[PDB]
């Protein structure tokens, strides 16, 4: 009921019905929950 | 004018499932079809083949959030799948 | 040690793959968002 | 955590904290029939 | 209100000419 | 204690540095970080009974640019400001050209105070703190964002890029101690940058109401 | 531009900023005006990046260029201008670099109009409008000759020159 609202314009941002931006980009990624999958990032942690 | 289009070219699901139903509906009634179809006859087969096809008498109507509207042909559009 | 014909092939796959990635707009996302909250919540137990 | 993020980023949109009740939520121009699918419904829709 | 700003201006154009010799 | 109150006082001094090299007044880096031990030496390490005392080290510091611009400290002996010291100062400053200034109050101020800042504010404006709120300073901490003021003219074709008016945007409390630490005022919008594990970096922008 | 003088400030001393002031004076003089506002972009430039009277002229030049219509810069500069004692050469070559300056000009011309648009809309003709036109005068008189004081403030004219605003004024009232 809090949130019945807050939905994605085609403008890639979220906006409520008054049209309050409240995230630029919808999960500050642009991308769905489905598409998203687990990673192991190799950059950090070994030494220089 | 061609130059302002500011939404993605990726058509999206919910375009896509309006198109094809609406599409099928005035086919069952018996819309000219400019489908070369194999032969059927559900109406939704032949929607889908439309679909795949790509050549949809309709343009969509995308409202941007400020009260302008865009409009999308199905042939500048490019399907996802 | 991919040839370049794997590596262009590999490159368009990545193209497709986050174009399909993308958040589409007009899903109700603040709703689906807290009601996958709730989910969870109700699997969990004061008892834990 | 595109769901978890989001809720919150909605609790604190206004500014400052807005617990998801009426006492909260009533609170906001949301459209006097909005607060009225909430928990009340006659103050709502007869101070509007 | 027309009528009490074109007074108001009739009002100023009055007295700006009358710091000419001063 | 004597050292505790010394020790307070310096920290006190560079949260101010801090404060003023933030919020863009041009202040020398000795200041901006000097030792314990060096303040100490400044100033008698005796402040209580001795002659380093409030109001001692009181500092006045311009803006890095339009030196026109010139900001100093009130550092009152009594724990409770009084309306007349507060109209003192007020009259310190009329002698001077510079219409800023800050207070820093050991116990609270009088409401009778905070309704004569309120009225004289238009004319010059001056801006209080609490010892214990600014001990410690706010943007250090990791939980805090980075923050950065913004201008009219980038606030403008920010606007008109969005394509949304002012009130669209979502806001943030004028009273709030971040909004109190930049000393941001109504209408004034603030960017932050944020850590986000989910996307590196994410910006946010916000309006002080 | 920028890069030429930071390249020959980058060997600033004493000396070096000696030479560079003494060329800057006899470019400026050559050129009758034009090097002026060179050479007072220069200073400010230097002062303003690894800088260190000239300080405060810096300062109320940044000022003035930072807010077009501003008036408490323009109010700290009379301040500081009234508040130099008589010098040889000193207030000329202040008055100099304030006035031999197209941007300064242009800047200087603004604060008037604005000055004199408030002025009407108060009703209160004759004041900081008047102080700020007997120092732009000064400031563009000061390159006839060296070693000057300032030139005629001229109230009883400065009634007459604000004559033609009024009556622009009136006619916009009674156009409208």
């Known amino acids: 009921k809090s949130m019945e609202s807050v939905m994605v314009k085609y403008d890639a ?23 998203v999958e687990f990673q192991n990032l190799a950059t950090l942690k070994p030494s220089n | 004018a061609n130059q302002k289009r500011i939404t993605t070219p990726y058509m999206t699901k919910y375009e896509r499932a309006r198109v094809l139903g609406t599409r099928a509906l005035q086919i069952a009634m018996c819309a000219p079809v400019m489908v ?18 790509r050549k949809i008498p309709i343009i969509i109507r995308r409202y941007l959030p400020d009260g302008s509207y865009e409009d999308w042909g199905v042939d500048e559009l490019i399907i996802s799948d | ?30 709703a689906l968002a807290a009601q996958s909250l709730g989910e969870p919540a109700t699997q969990m137990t004061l008892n834990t | 955590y595109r769901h978890l993020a ?8 206004r500014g400052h904290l807005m617990a998801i009740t009426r006492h909260g939520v009533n609170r906001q121009d ?19 | 209100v027309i009528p009490p700003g074109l007074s108001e201006e009739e009002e100023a154009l009055q007295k700006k000419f009358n710091k000419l010799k001063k | 204690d004597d050292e505790e109150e010394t020790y307070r006082l310096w920290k006190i001094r560079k949260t101010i540095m801090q404060l003023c090299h933030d919020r863009g007044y041009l202040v020398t880096q000795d200041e901006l970080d000097q030792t314990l031990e060096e303040f100490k030496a400044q100033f008698g390490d005796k402040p209580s009974e001795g002659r380093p005392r409030r109001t001692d080290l009181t500092v006045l510091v311009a803006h890095n640019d339009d030196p026109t611009d010139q900001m100093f400290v009130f550092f009152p002996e009594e724990p409770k400001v009084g309306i007349k010291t507060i109209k003192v100062y007020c009259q310190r400053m009329q002698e001077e050209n510079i219409t800023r200034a800050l207070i820093v109050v050991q116990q609270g101020m009088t409401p009778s105070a905070k309704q004569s800042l309120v009225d004289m504010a238009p004319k010059y404006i001056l801006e209080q703190f609490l010892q214990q709120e600014l001990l410690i300073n706010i943007t250090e901490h990791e939980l805090v964002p980075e923050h950065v003021v913004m201008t009219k003219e980038e606030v403008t074709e920010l606007l008109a890029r969005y394509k949304l008016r002012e009130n669209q945007l979502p806001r943030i409390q004028a009273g709030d ?13 603030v960017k932050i ?12 922008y916000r309006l002080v109401q | 531009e920028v890069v030429q003088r930071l390249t020959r400030m980058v060997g600033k001393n004493v000396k070096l900023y000696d030479m560079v002031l003494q060329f800057l004076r006899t470019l400026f003089l050559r050129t009758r005006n034009v090097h002026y506002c060179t050479l007072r972009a220069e200073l400010l430039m230097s002062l303003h990046d690894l800088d260190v009277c000239h300080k405060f002229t810096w300062c109320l030049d940044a000022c003035i260029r930072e807010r077009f219509v501003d008036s408490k810069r323009a109010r700290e500069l009379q301040g500081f201008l009234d508040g130099v004692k008589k010098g040889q050469e000193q207030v000329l070559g202040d008055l100099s670099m304030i006035l031999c300056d197209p941007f300064a000009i242009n800047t200087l011309a603004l604060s008037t109009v604005r000055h004199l648009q408030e002025l009407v809309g108060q009703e209160t003709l004759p004041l900081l409008l008047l102080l700020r036109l007997l120092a732009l005068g000064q400031g563009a008189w000061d390159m006839i000759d ?5 030139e005629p403030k001229m109230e009883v004219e400065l009634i007459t020159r604000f004559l033609p605003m009024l009556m622009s004024f009136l006619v916009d009232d009674y156009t409208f």
């Not at chain 1, 008054?18 to 991308?31: A, K, M, P």
């Not at chain 2, 070369?36 to 096809?53: F, N, S, V």
């Not at chain 4, 989001?6 to 949109?13: E, S």
């Open chain 6, 193 to 204: 940058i944020r850590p986000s594990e989910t996307a590196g970096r994410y910006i946010t």
């Open chain 4, 6 to 13: 989001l809720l919150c980023d909605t609790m604190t949109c």
């Open chain 4, 30 to 48: 949301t459209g006097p029939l909005m607060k009225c699918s909430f928990e009340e419904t006659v103050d709502v829709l007869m101070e509007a």
């Open chain 1, 13 to 35: 941002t979220v906006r409520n019905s008054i049209n309050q931006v409240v995230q630029l980009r919808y999960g500050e990624d642009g991308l769905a929950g489905e598409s």
């Open chain 3, 1 to 30: 040690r991919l040839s370049g014909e794997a590596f262009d092939w590999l490159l368009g796959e990545i193209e497709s793959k986050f174009n399909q990635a993308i958040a589409h707009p007009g899903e109700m996302v603040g």
């Open chain 7, 146 to 150: 060296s070693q000057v004081f300032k």
């Open chain 6, 177 to 189: 101690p971040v909004a109190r630490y930049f000393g941001i005022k109504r209408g004034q919008v």
């Open chain 2, 36 to 53: 070369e179809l194999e032969g059927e006859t559900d109406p939704l087969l032949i929607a889908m083949k439309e679909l795949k096809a």
